Design a protein around this ligand. Structure first.
Ligand SMILES: O=C(N[C@H](CO)[C@H](O)c1ccc([N+](=O)[O-])cc1)C(Cl)Cl
Ligand SMILES: [K+]
Ligand SMILES: [K+]
Ligand SMILES: [K+]
Ligand SMILES: [K+]
Ligand SMILES: [K+]
Ligand SMILES: [K+]
Ligand SMILES: [K+]
Ligand SMILES: [K+]
Ligand SMILES: [K+]
Ligand SMILES: [K+]
Ligand SMILES: [K+]
Ligand SMILES: [Mg+2]
Ligand SMILES: [Mg+2]
Ligand SMILES: [Mg+2]
Ligand SMILES: [Mg+2]
Ligand SMILES: [Mg+2]
Ligand SMILES: [Mg+2]
Ligand SMILES: [Mg+2]
Ligand SMILES: [Mg+2]
Ligand SMILES: [Mg+2]
Ligand SMILES: [Mg+2]
Ligand SMILES: [Mg+2]
Ligand SMILES: [Mg+2]
Ligand SMILES: [Mg+2]
Ligand SMILES: [Mg+2]
Ligand SMILES: [Mg+2]
Ligand SMILES: [Mg+2]
Ligand SMILES: [Mg+2]
Ligand SMILES: [Mg+2]
Ligand SMILES: [Mg+2]
Ligand SMILES: [Mg+2]
Ligand SMILES: [Mg+2]
Ligand SMILES: [Mg+2]
Ligand SMILES: [Mg+2]
Ligand SMILES: [Mg+2]
Ligand SMILES: [Mg+2]
Ligand SMILES: [Mg+2]
Ligand SMILES: [Mg+2]
Ligand SMILES: [Mg+2]
Ligand SMILES: [Mg+2]
Ligand SMILES: [Mg+2]
Ligand SMILES: [Mg+2]
Ligand SMILES: [Mg+2]
Ligand SMILES: [Mg+2]
Ligand SMILES: [Mg+2]
Ligand SMILES: [Mg+2]
Ligand SMILES: [Mg+2]
Ligand SMILES: [Mg+2]
Ligand SMILES: [Mg+2]
Ligand SMILES: [Mg+2]
Ligand SMILES: [Mg+2]
Ligand SMILES: [Mg+2]
Lengths: 58, 135, 80
RNA sequence: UGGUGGCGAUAGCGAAGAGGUCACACCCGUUCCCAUACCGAACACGGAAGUUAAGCUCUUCAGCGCCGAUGGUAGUCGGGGGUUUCCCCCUGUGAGAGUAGGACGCCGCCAA
RNA sequence: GGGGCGGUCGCCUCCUAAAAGGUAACGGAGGCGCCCAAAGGUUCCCUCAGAAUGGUUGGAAAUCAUUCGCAGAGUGUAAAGGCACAAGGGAGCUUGACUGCGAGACCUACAAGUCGAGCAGGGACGAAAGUCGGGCUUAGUGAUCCGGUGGUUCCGCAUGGAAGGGCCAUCGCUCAACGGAUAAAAGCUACCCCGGGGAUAACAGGCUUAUCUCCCCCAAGAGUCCACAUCGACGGGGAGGUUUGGCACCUCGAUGUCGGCUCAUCGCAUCCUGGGGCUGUAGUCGGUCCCAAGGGUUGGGCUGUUCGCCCAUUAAAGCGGUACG
RNA sequence: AGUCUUGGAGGUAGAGCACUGAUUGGACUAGGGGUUACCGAAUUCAGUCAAACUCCGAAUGCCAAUGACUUAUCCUUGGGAGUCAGACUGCGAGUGAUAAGAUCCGUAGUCGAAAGGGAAACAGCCCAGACCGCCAGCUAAGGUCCCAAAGUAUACGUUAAGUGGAAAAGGAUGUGGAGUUGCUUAGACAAUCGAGUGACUCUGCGCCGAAAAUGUACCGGGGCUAAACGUAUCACCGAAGCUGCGGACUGUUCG
RNA sequence: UACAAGUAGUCAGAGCCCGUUAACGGGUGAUGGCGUGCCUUUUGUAGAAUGAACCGGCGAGUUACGAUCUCGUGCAAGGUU
């Protein structure tokens, strides 16, 4: 399966560790969407920045 | 006036008063008691005023357990000094009271007498309280 | 007017504690743990220095292990 | 049974019984090797008159000690809110205490 | 937390320190500038505090003896971390409290600091295995320059020597302001000067409100009786922002500072006058609280004064804010 | 480098009383005092508390390992710097009075060096990072009666205080929702009569307590009984965010 | 342009007057929205901190000799006076 992760909220005003996780998903811009494989690694990243991102199963 | 016979350190940190009381949340010894609803330092002066108030109302007619002990020292700097140049001298003694702590307990009187005795004591204290019974 | 404090002294912090991780490869002589006394004991292929420093005797993998009921030890096991 | 290892007192302590011919002990000698801030107590070296009393071995016991969940609660990472010495809510995590329960040894190797 | 004065300055241990490490304050506690020729090394052996019970001196406490006894002792010394297969106690023999070093680590701006298996030389103890490069661990120290002493297959200003230097070892620092400006150093300035700072004080503002002023809660009591006419102990809660302070945010290429004079203006916690409730209000007077800011609210003596005391008035001689207008 | 997985070091939060201190009551008493509980240390049972207590002990953070998924950093050497006054906000502490827009650390953010929208105005709060153009579009925080863009939206409740739109102990038949309980048509309660009434606990929203100085002056204003508060739902407005269209430049990879 | 509250502009915008390097032109500007100069120094300045009356001119990392690094060129185990 593939997840479709969108950066809903800005990384401005957020802890460095959250900003790095957002950036590591390939999200460089607010409202940008990236497609990743559904697995425990990507799900664990989503969990850390769940308040910043919107996810939907592709 | 309650104070320790001795202490290990005369100058302690003020600490913090998060959370409910660790122990003494129920009326253990007596029949009735007065429970803290709010966190505060209770000075030994406040305990004594509270103790005499309830004791006088009962007319030698019942026993009182003071469940809090003012173990903690607090300091103050002399009047009209600048900041720094070391910690202040010990001034007084406080008990740290958190929500749930039963402060005083009464036995050997009616509920009517106990309620009024503990009401009179409550007005000496800097916290909201409630009357409680042993379950 | 003001008095003075009789305190204000401290020693230099000595950077004690673990210097290599469990599972990490170490060369012979690598300090594994600095300590006062034996908070951790020398296990297999680990020596205790004059100031209680635990060090690897061999090249190998570090393993912090339980030593009986209360105590701990650190060992180095050869890679194979 | 004796020796000698490994394993967190789940191995311990305590209590009550049982068992010795060989083996292990206690035991009986101090002439010699050796010995005690004094003593063959111990450590040594020698013996086998008799004893399972003790150690040791095997059973029974949860009184103490030990091990110990589940659930709940405290705390708390992250995200919010409020009346902000503090408090509350949400996804997650999660003790200590208490308790169910476990447990009066488990796994070697050698000799007889 | 302006400067002065006081205190402090390097090193070790703990706490603060937010369960790696590190982490500040004129934060909270203590130590160090050594000691030991065994209190070091090794081999072998051992177990402590205290209590109970019994004992001529002898007692709670000397010395036995018995049982109990995770340490409730000890570990040269501060503390922490350790330590009873002891790192604690005892005894024998010793000098490894060794020389050359050192894979590799830790720590770290640098300078330094720390740990180290292992190799060689020659030893100590041990039957051997082995352990030993001081001490249970972590303080007990000080760069360079210069000079002294000992050693030396080094250099030696034509050459041989020497003088002197080098190298190795070691000594001389409360250089303690302890990374040590010099081998060698105290004060006054209101006769002062320059460069700077609102990085930093004195004025006023601001924040704060301990203190201050005012208002409350509880009601033990006082009040002949009677808590609440009036007053209100022990305690508790606020408001104000006029006091004394705290802080150092604006201003040091200048924000003039006390008192008075002139001119006021605002708040009301009301001094007078107006209207009231309660009264321990007979009346006349008063007390206390409520409403009320319209207007009013003195001339002198002393003192720079504000303030205060005094004289004599007045219906009254209000209290505060306005850069202490 | 992030995340997952796995292992580890460590003693905070919490908790606990096993040690060290502090400490409450009872039981029972050495012993010392007026033969006595006359008072008693230890002991024993229960009970409190701790930055410098710990039989315990998290969340996190930290150090690694192995793959995986993702990301593009990282290291070394050399040339050139600047910086060594920081600020506030949230959280964890000290100092202080658990005062300060105070001070001093830890940690994250923003400001500094960051314009845009919101918070009336307002470096540091909330939202969000401005290459340039557009009389396009969708959103964020915050909003939608008028100033002022968008709901005088919908549904069900609450408040009568302009609470909302400063302030505590304490005081009170305010009012809404729960629950417990006494008494009562064998006639309660109020003053014979005729249906209820009178205590308490928890809880929502209000009330008093509430006095400052140029002028309403403690919603930005008007004004509001909702245009307030709570719960739920859907529209819409709203930024220099994102998208669209056009242009410029830089980098990477293959115009 | 004499009912107006102004860091003086900016964007929106009628009306009136013009007519160009001919451009989805020029001048003026009722009215609407937004908007606290520049510099320095600062944690932070519209600042009630500093500096400048205005305009013009003049007015501040240079050169020499050494060193070092990068780049370039010549030659290269040599190079160069
Ligand atoms: O020094 C002066 N005034 C300064 C501002 O420059 C300030 O107003 C001030 C006044 C008085 C004061 N005091 O009395 O201590 C202190 C500062 C000048 Cl007016 Cl002389
Ligand atoms: K100060
Ligand atoms: K010896
Ligand atoms: K110095
Ligand atoms: K002034
Ligand atoms: K009041
Ligand atoms: K000045
Ligand atoms: K008046
Ligand atoms: K902070
Ligand atoms: K209002
Ligand atoms: K305009
Ligand atoms: K000035
Ligand atoms: Mg330390
Ligand atoms: Mg040593
Ligand atoms: Mg001095
Ligand atoms: Mg930490
Ligand atoms: Mg740490
Ligand atoms: Mg010199
Ligand atoms: Mg010569
Ligand atoms: Mg120095
Ligand atoms: Mg110096
Ligand atoms: Mg003179
Ligand atoms: Mg003169
Ligand atoms: Mg001058
Ligand atoms: Mg200043
Ligand atoms: Mg001042
Ligand atoms: Mg001023
Ligand atoms: Mg009083
Ligand atoms: Mg002041
Ligand atoms: Mg400051
Ligand atoms: Mg000036
Ligand atoms: Mg009044
Ligand atoms: Mg004045
Ligand atoms: Mg705690
Ligand atoms: Mg700082
Ligand atoms: Mg500050
Ligand atoms: Mg940190
Ligand atoms: Mg700057
Ligand atoms: Mg930034
Ligand atoms: Mg803004
Ligand atoms: Mg605005
Ligand atoms: Mg600015
Ligand atoms: Mg829309
Ligand atoms: Mg509109
Ligand atoms: Mg209001
Ligand atoms: Mg953009
Ligand atoms: Mg006109
Ligand atoms: Mg008009
Ligand atoms: Mg300044
Ligand atoms: Mg001006
Ligand atoms: Mg200046
Ligand atoms: Mg000027
Ligand atoms: Mg000029």
């Amino acid at each position: 399966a593939k997840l479709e992760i969108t950066l809903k909220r800005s990384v401005i005003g957020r802890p460095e560790d959250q900003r790095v996780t957002v950036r590591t998903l390939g999200l460089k811009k607010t409202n940008q969407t990236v497609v990743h494989e559904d697995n425990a690694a990507i799900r664990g990243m989503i969990n850390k920045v769940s308040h910043l991102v919107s996810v939907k199963e592709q | 006036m309650l104070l320790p016979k001795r202490v290990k350190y005369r100058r302690e940190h003020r600490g913090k008063m998060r959370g409910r009381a660790k122990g003494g949340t129920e009326v253990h010894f007596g029949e009735f008691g007065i429970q803290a609803l709010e966190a505060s330092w209770i000075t030994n002066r406040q305990i004594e005023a509270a103790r005499i108030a309830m004791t006088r109302y009962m007319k030698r007619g019942g026993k009182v357990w003071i469940k809090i002990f003012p173990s903690k020292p607090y300091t103050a700097k002399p009047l009209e000094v600048r900041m720094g140049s070391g910690k202040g001298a010990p001034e007084g003694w406080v008990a740290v009271v958190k929500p749930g702590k039963v402060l005083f307990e009464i036995s050997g009187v009616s509920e009517e007498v106990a309620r009024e005795a503990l009401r009179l004591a409550s007005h000496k204290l800097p916290i909201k309280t409630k009357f409680v019974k042993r379950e | 007017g003001v008095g003075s404090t009789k305190n204000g002294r401290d020693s230099e912090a000595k950077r004690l504690g673990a210097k290599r991780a469990d599972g990490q490869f170490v060369t012979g002589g690598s300090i594994l743990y600095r300590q006062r006394g034996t908070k951790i004991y020398p296990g297999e292929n680990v020596g205790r220095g004059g100031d209680d420093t635990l060090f690897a005797k061999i090249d190998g993998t570090v393993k912090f292990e339980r030593f009986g009921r209360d105590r701990k030890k650190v060992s180095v096991y050869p890679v194979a």
